[PDB]
Write a protein that binds this ligand. Structure first.
Ligand code: XED
Lengths: 125, 126
């Protein structure tokens, strides 16, 4: 029935490339510049979804988010470029004044603690 | 016979002429030795530290660009693993994932990096 467009079936959204085949386990750069993903059943991704070992975050419209994003009073940072969540890493502040540290589980360290070894190796908790 | 396919040492500095005899100038070159080289506007081969297109690089006495950690004048620096460009004002992971190393804006390693943490969690490194 559908073709080359988002299609809502039984309360769920799917996408049918310009040939009548619904995308399953497939990313797609929509005509709106946003990125969408469809799981094995063709369903449009919504919310935090893990795809190929990398975590992503889609809003309620199914559009992938990038950059800082708040999720239940806690921040995360999805690669401004690729969208994949960053973890155990330092992200430079917007005004290049400093850095924010993302714990190994994606969450922002509101209060990161450092300890410097004699050679300068920085360990964070 | 004009020079072709070789590094030519002309009274003083080093140069390189490709197979058609062109003198490489203001451009890189990946030699048959797996090394990258760079030449002046005058085609002189690069030695030591060179700033090329707003990025720093380090070549050995022989012109070969270096990558990774290099100690220069008793202080450590970190050249990109592939790119080779000198990293600065950034944190590099140690080879064993244990922690990190901070490279100052001037490229040098930080012995005693000083930390400051804002209320929201913003980190400042002196
Ligand atoms: C595709 C590549 C790879 O290598 C290059 C380089 N560099 C090669 C050396 N590395 C360390 C930095 C990139 C460059 F600076 C400019 C050009 C460049 O200008 C060019 C071109 O065709 O015009 C082609 N090449 C170029």
């Amino acid at each position: 029935y559908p073709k080359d467009k988002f299609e809502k079936i039984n309360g769920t959204w799917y996408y049918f490339d310009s040939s009548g085949y619904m995308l399953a386990d497939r990313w797609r750069k929509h005509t709106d510049g946003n990125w969408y993903w469809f799981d094995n059943s063709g369903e449009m991704a919504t919310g935090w979804k893990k795809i190929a070992d990398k975590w992503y975050y889609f809003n309620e419209e199914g559009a992938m988010k990038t950059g800082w994003v708040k999720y239940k009073d806690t921040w995360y940072y999805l690669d401004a470029k690729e969208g994949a969540m960053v973890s155990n890493a330092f992200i430079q502040s917007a005004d290049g004044t400093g850095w924010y540290y993302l714990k190994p589980d994606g969450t922002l360290a509101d209060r990161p603690e450092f300890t410097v070894e004699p050679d300068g190796l920085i360990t964070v908790k």
